[PDB]
Amino acid sequence: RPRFSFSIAAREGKARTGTIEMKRGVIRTPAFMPVGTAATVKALKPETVRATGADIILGNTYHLMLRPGAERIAKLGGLHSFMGWDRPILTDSGGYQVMSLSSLTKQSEEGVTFKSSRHMLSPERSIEIQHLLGSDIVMAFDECTPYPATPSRAASSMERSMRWAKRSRDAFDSRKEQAENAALFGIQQGSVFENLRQQSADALAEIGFDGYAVGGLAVGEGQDEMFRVLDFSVPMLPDDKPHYLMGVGKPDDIVGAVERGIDMFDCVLPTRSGRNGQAFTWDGPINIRNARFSEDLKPLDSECHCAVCQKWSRAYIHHLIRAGEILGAMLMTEHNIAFYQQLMQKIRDSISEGRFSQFAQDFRARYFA
Amino acid sequence: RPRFSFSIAAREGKARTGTIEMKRGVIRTPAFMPVGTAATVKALKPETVRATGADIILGNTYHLMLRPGAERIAKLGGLHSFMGWDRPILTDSGGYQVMSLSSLTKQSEEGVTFKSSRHMLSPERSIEIQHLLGSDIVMAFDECTPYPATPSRAASSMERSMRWAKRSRDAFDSRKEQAENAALFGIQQGSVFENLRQQSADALAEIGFDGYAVGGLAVGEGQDEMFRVLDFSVPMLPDDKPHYLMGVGKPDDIVGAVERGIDMFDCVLPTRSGRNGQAFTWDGPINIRNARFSEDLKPLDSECHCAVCQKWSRAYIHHLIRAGEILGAMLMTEHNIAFYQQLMQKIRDSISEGRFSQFAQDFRARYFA
Numbered sequence A, B: 001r002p003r004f005s006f007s008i009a010a011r012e013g014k015a016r017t018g019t020i021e022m023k024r025g026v027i028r029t030p031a032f033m034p035v036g037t038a039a040t041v042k043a044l045k046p047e048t049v050r051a052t053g054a055d056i057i058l059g060n061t062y063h064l065m066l067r068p069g070a071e072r073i074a075k076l077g078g079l080h081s082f083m084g085w086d087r088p089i090l091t092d093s094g095g096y097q098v099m100s101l102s103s104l105t106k107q108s109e110e111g112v113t114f115k116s117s118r119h120m121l122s123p124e125r126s127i128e129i130q131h132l133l134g135s136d137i138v139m140a141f142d143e144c145t146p147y148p149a150t151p152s153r154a155a156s157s158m159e160r161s162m163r164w165a166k167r168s169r170d171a172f173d174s175r176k177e178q179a180e181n182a183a184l185f186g187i188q189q190g191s192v193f194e195n196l197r198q199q200s201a202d203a204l205a206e207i208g209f210d211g212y213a214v215g216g217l218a219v220g221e222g223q224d225e226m227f228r229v230l231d232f233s234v235p236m237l238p239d240d241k242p243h244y245l246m247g248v249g250k251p252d253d254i255v256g257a258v259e260r261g262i263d264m265f266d267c268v269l270p271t272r273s274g275r276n277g278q279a280f281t282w283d284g285p286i287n288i289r290n291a292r293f294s295e296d297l298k299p300l301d302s303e304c305h306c307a308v309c310q311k312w313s314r315a316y317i318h319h320l321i322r323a324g325e326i327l328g329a330m331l332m333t334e335h336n337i338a339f340y341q342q343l344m345q346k347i348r349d350s351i352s353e354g355r356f357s358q359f360a361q362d363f364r365a366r367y368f369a
């Protein structure tokens, strides 16, 4: 019923748990968003994505504007109807993918021109594409500063992102239907530099957003450095709005980020690694292709509540993946996404119950044994 | 409850409809068996295969004996438990696939030695592999005569198959658990030659089987010739047992074969063509990759009752297949197998109601319009 309402139900240290209520559904936080870049969470029907526990999925302005096209998706009824997912969708703004995937780019104050075949992205165009898609959470159009960067290059990059954040805010607010039905998140930049992170947080808070992402991380800096930056960066963001760490991550990354005040996550790891034969378990990842699993009748994980672990053995899935069978990718992906959702549920419950510190400790001791 | 009981409920001309009762379930006839060569019906969970209406699926002695291995599958609890399909499974005997897929073969009265890596198949070994798999319908080990063949080569080939049929019968009967719980089908050979087909039918009937397959067809002869051979060959088989046409086929092939007395079918077409972008419809096949479907909001088929057609558009599936997305293969395959099952249901109902001739006419007029 509400457009966007974030409520924090419980806290432990910097960790929080609660809910975001939106018109298309409730998002339990901390939340993990399966990635659906090509208007599909790879190898899963939307009903299966929901069955694993996902409340919201992620889509991408960059990919969808190229294929099948934003105007086309709008003509077909919007992204939700198109792919058959009726719950909230967050869309990245294109700011990162344009620089990561394009064959040629030209950057300027206006935006980014690129070859996929020539196209343009700008704060205004990004917001309009996300409107055409019918995104529930719209990301500001930003620049993900390369890593490493000199302080001066990080500063000029972050400042451009802040000017683009204001343009994103204005474009979103100009579109009445979008402003009434969707939410807009700003993206903090500043590389690894505390003063720049502060300047970025200040600029975003002055503009005002429904939520705040920590951008510019998970770009090769490694966990120690990422955690160091989160240590000072997250407290700079408004406490009363959600905090979204873009592109993170491995299970231990998620746990440590929640310890540092992050509420939302997305990553291709569970889907991509699932297809590649890696299954997540409470005792750490396993590669199901390994010969040691060829006659193993146990499920992928001994505690996992997912449909895959209720029905099929490691031995069968091993056979499927080694044979290159589509069902192998399906089962591995469903299990991995379910594992990620169970991780988030355990995080939420432990924070609610004031035992998250103990959970994090127990989780790590077992996962890395 | 019974091991194997075939009942014919209704007839129209040469067409029949009825049921095969087996310990693991009832098979409604005429029946279409989805193919699950690598211990999976490609891109479908077993529950989805069942949801489309399938009563029985097909597996393959040749593929499974190589990967993951027959003794291995038995150690893991049998094929049913391994893949999660608890209903009847028919297994081909290896007789056809060994000659179709092997890199090198040596044929003799004993059987066939082949390179996948050196292995052997014989009537006794084939029956034992099918026992280890836990097949419900076991096929005799035969030789699918190449096409075309001289009458003399067809004759010597068919005669060897008949000697192998008796050895198959004896091997099956020697295994008490198999003889008590499974059924054994013989395979008629004789190429396109009426006298040889008759000699083959006579030999098989003298031995006695639970069902009779028409082998040696769908080998490049084309529909006209296949129908010509079926015209005289099917009446040679015992009327009171099921008639199984191996490897057939396209929807019109199935309809014409039922008109000629066939009760059971298997084919990779719906699964394989589904993955390749071909969808079956009552107005004929379509290729969903075609640009004409890019903004088509209609389901794959306007009448189809399957879950895919209830939820997703041609436009979305077009996008998925062009993007190489696994969900594209999943949805196309589910629809195609569901279409095949709906075809079989319409065939069964029309025979039951004494209007199958009219159905065949109406079907063709529309399918080929």
Ligand SMILES: COC(=O)c1ccc(CCNc2nc3cc4nc(N)[nH]c(=O)c4cc3[nH]2)cc1
Binding pocket: A092, A093, A094, A095, A096, A097, A139, A142, A143, A144, A145, A187, A214, A215, A216, A217, A218, A219, A220, A221, A246, A247, A248
């Ligand atoms: C050498 O590179 C690497 O090691 C490496 C490590 C992790 C990822 C996972 C993805 N991480 C990630 N996704 C991201 C997406 C983003 N989107 C926007 N709009 N702005 C950002 O600031 C941003 C940062 C990201 N970081 C990708 C690359």
Ligand SMILES: COC(=O)c1ccc(CCNc2nc3cc4nc(N)[nH]c(=O)c4cc3[nH]2)cc1
Binding pocket: B092, B093, B094, B095, B096, B097, B139, B142, B143, B144, B145, B187, B214, B215, B216, B217, B218, B219, B220, B221, B246, B247, B248
């Ligand atoms: C040039 O070749 C072609 O045109 C062509 C046409 C259709 C198929 C589909 C498959 N047809 C088929 N599968 C078959 C499987 C069989 N198994 C046994 N044990 N004995 C047979 O006698 C037999 C015949 C078959 N015929 C395969 C090949």
Ligand SMILES: [Zn+2]
Binding pocket: A300, A301, A304, A305, A306, A307, A308, A309, A310, A335, A336, A338, A339
């Ligand atoms: Zn699981």
Ligand SMILES: [Zn+2]
Binding pocket: B300, B301, B304, B305, B306, B307, B308, B309, B310, B335, B336, B338, B339
């Ligand atoms: Zn359908």
